[PDB]
Amino acid sequence: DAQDKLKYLVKQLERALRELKKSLDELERSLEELEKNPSEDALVENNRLNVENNKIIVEVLRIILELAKASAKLA
Amino acid sequence: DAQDKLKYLVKQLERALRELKKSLDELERSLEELEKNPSEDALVENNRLNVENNKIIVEVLRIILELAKASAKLA
Amino acid sequence: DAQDKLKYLVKQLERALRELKKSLDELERSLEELEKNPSEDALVENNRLNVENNKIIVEVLRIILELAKASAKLA
Ligand SMILES: N[C@]12C[C@H]3C[C@H](C[C@H](C3)C1)C2
Ligand code: NA
């Protein structure tokens, strides 16, 4: 099953990276707004989006750990 | 040695991801506090925790590079 | 071609991680400055550098996805 499981995990990684890119775009837009008009509200919003981007990164890294675990089997 | 080295590196990745999750939890708690009561102090603390989370991510990515390097040998 | 492509992708990952480390260093310096003398300007600058570090992380993760895709071929 390892090779097929790896195929699925690659699809999961692709999907998560599409989500991560959307997050990064939102974060970059919020940064542009912050730089244009700095304020407490713009700082908080930017931080919020930064934290969410980190969260998604952690999710991506967990999928990569599953790739490594499924690879070990055939190794 | 490559297959055994990969086993060790997977254990390192697991351990680092446990550390990353603890960091992300701390970061998310700091975000909640910031949103509840925004202030300069809460902003700095949240940024601090965000930077630490990035640091840990870089450490995780270096372990993944070692996975790729050890895989190449048997490739 | 998969094994050779993987060699190239490992070189790309190494290069990107050198860039990521330089970014993390800049980010950590900006954090130290922020903690020393907090201000709106120091907050924005730190956020800017944090976002850039996330951007580079996303680039690194895309290289790892290409590693997984090239591995699947020989799997
Ligand atoms: N074989 C691997 C390809 C990719 C990089 C590294 C960790 C995971 C994902 C498995 C080696
Ligand atoms: Na921030």
Author numbering:
A (entry chain A), B (entry chain A), C (entry chain A): 1 to 75
Q: What does the original paper state about this entry?
A:
The interactions critical for amantadine binding include hydrogen bonds from Ser-71 to the polar amino group of amantadine and a shape complementary binding pocket composed by Ile-64, Leu-67, and Ala-68.
Crystallization screen trays were set up with the same protein sample with or without ~five fold molar excess amantadine (7.5 mM). Crystals were obtained in the presence but not the absence of amantadine, consistent with ordering upon amantadine binding. The X-ray crystal structure of ABP+amantadine was solved to 1.04 Å, providing a high-resolution view of the ABP-amantadine complex structure. The crystal structure overlays well with the design model, with an RMSD of 0.63 Å (TMAlign [Zhang and Skolnick, 2005]). In the original design model, the amino group of amantadine was oriented to hydrogen bond directly to Ser-71 in ABP, but in the X-ray crystal structure, amantadine was found to be rotated 60° with ordered water molecules mediating hydrogen bonds to Ser-71 residues in ABP.
